Enzyme design. Structure first.
Site, short mmCIF file in Angstrom:
data_model
loop_
_atom_site.label_atom_id
_atom_site.label_comp_id
_atom_site.label_asym_id
_atom_site.label_seq_id
_atom_site.Cartn_x
_atom_site.Cartn_y
_atom_site.Cartn_z
N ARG A 130 0.82 -1.20 0.00
CA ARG A 130 0.00 0.00 0.00
C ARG A 130 0.86 1.27 0.00
O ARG A 130 0.42 2.32 0.47
CB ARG A 130 -0.91 -0.02 1.23
CG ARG A 130 -1.81 -1.26 1.34
CD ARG A 130 -2.42 -1.41 2.74
NE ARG A 130 -1.40 -1.72 3.74
CZ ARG A 130 -1.63 -1.80 5.05
NH1 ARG A 130 -2.85 -1.60 5.52
NH2 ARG A 130 -0.63 -2.07 5.88
N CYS A 149 -7.97 11.27 -10.06
CA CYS A 149 -6.60 10.96 -9.68
C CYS A 149 -5.69 10.67 -10.89
O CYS A 149 -4.63 10.16 -10.51
CB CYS A 149 -6.52 9.82 -8.64
SG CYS A 149 -6.85 8.14 -9.20
N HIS A 150 -5.54 11.63 -11.80
CA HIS A 150 -4.68 11.51 -12.98
C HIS A 150 -3.55 10.45 -12.95
O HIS A 150 -3.40 9.67 -13.89
CB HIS A 150 -4.04 12.87 -13.29
CG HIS A 150 -3.15 12.86 -14.49
ND1 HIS A 150 -3.65 12.83 -15.78
CD2 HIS A 150 -1.81 12.76 -14.60
CE1 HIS A 150 -2.65 12.71 -16.63
NE2 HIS A 150 -1.52 12.66 -15.94
N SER A 170 -3.48 8.84 -18.84
CA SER A 170 -3.20 9.27 -20.20
C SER A 170 -1.75 9.75 -20.24
O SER A 170 -1.24 10.29 -19.27
CB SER A 170 -4.14 10.41 -20.65
OG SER A 170 -3.65 11.68 -20.28
N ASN A 180 8.55 12.78 -17.74
CA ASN A 180 8.07 12.00 -16.59
C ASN A 180 8.91 10.80 -16.22
O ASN A 180 8.99 10.43 -15.06
CB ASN A 180 6.63 11.54 -16.84
CG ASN A 180 5.64 12.66 -16.68
OD1 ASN A 180 4.53 12.60 -17.21
ND2 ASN A 180 6.03 13.68 -15.94
N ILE A 211 -0.01 10.04 -29.24
CA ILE A 211 0.96 10.88 -29.92
C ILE A 211 0.14 11.99 -30.60
O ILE A 211 -0.84 11.71 -31.28
CB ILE A 211 1.75 10.10 -31.02
CG1 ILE A 211 2.76 9.16 -30.37
CG2 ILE A 211 2.45 11.08 -31.96
CD1 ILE A 211 3.63 8.39 -31.38
N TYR A 212 0.51 13.25 -30.40
CA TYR A 212 -0.22 14.34 -31.05
C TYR A 212 0.18 14.42 -32.52
O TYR A 212 1.35 14.24 -32.86
CB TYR A 212 0.05 15.69 -30.36
CG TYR A 212 -0.82 15.91 -29.14
CD1 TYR A 212 -0.36 15.60 -27.86
CD2 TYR A 212 -2.14 16.35 -29.28
CE1 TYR A 212 -1.20 15.71 -26.75
CE2 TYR A 212 -2.98 16.46 -28.19
CZ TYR A 212 -2.51 16.14 -26.93
OH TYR A 212 -3.38 16.23 -25.86
#
Ligand SMILES: O=P(O)(O)CCCP(=O)(O)O
Ligand SMILES: O=P(O)(O)CCCP(=O)(O)O
EC number: 2.1.1.45
Lengths: 264, 264
Positions: A130, A149-150, A170, A180, A211-212
């Site tokens: 936990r 909670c992204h 995402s 990140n 992917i943009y």
């Protein structure tokens, strides 16, 4: 021995057809895949992407900002990276539950300190399952009741090695992911350093990996670049409290990246 | 074309050395790995493990029980699978936040209905990345303040296909995983059926993937079994509300498994 970056590169290749068109909150187009995971060794090496120069300065400076629980946008912009910015990541990591009045109010001992709690649990019960921490997207806080909670980033310990797994609902493969990876790998190094543990592995798990569209060309070129050995992070000093870290305590070594790649 | 089961089998092989010893809440020994993921196609097939007979009866019966939001242990035991059982999964899926008095109290409209909210979001904004739902471990509820949520299972939509990704902070590879794969794949079939979507993929992501010591021998034998084509689930009726599902609405077909394998 395999390379960790070949995973990111390979994931990019997989998105570029076999990717499907999908619009985001703004409506901008992206190529998306659902469900992805990658493992990065933190043993004598730091996962700082080499196929492009990652803005390490921003990674470190922004992390120290979140760790300080500061919600002052100015406190970050003055550090050389970018007044009231609402309850951002910092306010959640240190005051989970407490109500945010303003960047000047006091929240000492107020709300759950997710970060410290992880550190404490590591040193009181390393086998625990936990050891999870739980960032949110400010935008969703007022939207509905009890929003999800992204991202969340459960820690794991074994054989004196601290591992970390980050799960994001995402992920922006082009800009967000590389940043990140390094970001949380750094956090893991910090937690491991104060807990007297050795960095183990960092696993990045995604939900909607996208992917943009306007990033397709730069990424296609980036795939043609041969990865170079990951660098090495060094904490050239002894720290006991997570709050006692300073940008001068860390030092990247052997970082030989490819040219920077701008992305909108 | 690859087989989905080869993933589970392969994960089992990976745990069995390269697995590390680690004690759990009870202290029992287990071989553990941190970070795992697998994808199972839900397109014209149901991920019901074939290398051993999975208790499909329990899967279905238990799901219908959770969907009913019932916290009555007796309501499940009477169904042929196993009075006040506290705020279990059902009470969380339908009354997230509401306080549990007893299995006789009324909670209509009380607390957030995570499940219905997922269904609603699917049909009002399929591109959404916040289609997440969020089970907890009752045991942790009183333990501390704001505990982390044993499992969460974000949904994803695209091209009229509903996908699901389940993330568990810990997974019992021997007994839990096979059951949960089928379980959530079923849930996905239900949600997809009432939302007018086609089942896409089910991704199972784990944090602490562990094998219990006393399960090593049975599992070693199970690895020597050749997987058979997955079965097919059929919803032989038209349902509009998730609460209107009955164990007679579903039918497994082509399920030809290997002998059952008992595990403590
Ligand atoms: O859906 P989340 O929580 O990943 C929000 C970021 C979306 P964008 O600002 O439209 O890129
Ligand atoms: O650590 P979690 O939430 O996965 C709890 C189940 C542990 P066991 O009952 O000791 O097997």
């Amino acid at each position: 021995p395999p390379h960790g970056e070949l995973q990111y590169l390979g994931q990019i290749q997989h998105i570029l057809r076999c990717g499907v068109r999908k619009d985001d909150r703004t409506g901008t187009g992206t190529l998306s895949v659902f469900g992805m995971q990658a493992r990065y060794s933190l043993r004598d090496e730091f996962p700082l992407l080499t196929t492009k120069r990652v803005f390490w300065k921003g990674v470190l400076e922004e992390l120290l900002w979140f760790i300080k629980g500061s919600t002052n946008a100015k406190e970050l912009s003055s550090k050389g990276v970018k007044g009231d910015l609402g309850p951002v990541y910092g306010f959640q990591w240190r005051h989970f539950g407490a109500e945010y009045r303003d960047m000047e109010s006091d929240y000492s001992g107020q709300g759950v300190d997710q970060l410290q709690r992880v550190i404490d649990t590591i040193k009181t019960n390393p086998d625990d399952r936990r050891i999870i921490m739980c960032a949110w997207n400010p935008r969703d806080l007022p939207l509905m009741a009890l929003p999800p909670c992204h991202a969340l980033c459960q820690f794991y310990v074994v054989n004196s090695e601290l591992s970390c797994q980050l799960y994001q609902r995402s992920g922006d493969m082009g800009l967000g992911v590389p940043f990140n990876i390094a970001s949380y790998a750094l956090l893991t190094y910090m937690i491991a350093h104060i807990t007297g543990l050795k960095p183990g592995d960092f696993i990045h798990t995604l939900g909607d990996a996208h992917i943009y569209l306007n990033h397709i060309e730069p990424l296609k070129i980036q795939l043609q670049r041969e990865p170079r050995p990951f660098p090495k992070l060094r904490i050239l000093r002894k720290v006991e409290k997570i709050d006692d870290f300073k940008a001068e305590d860390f030092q990247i070594e052997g970082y030989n990246p490819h040219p920077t790649i701008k992305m909108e």
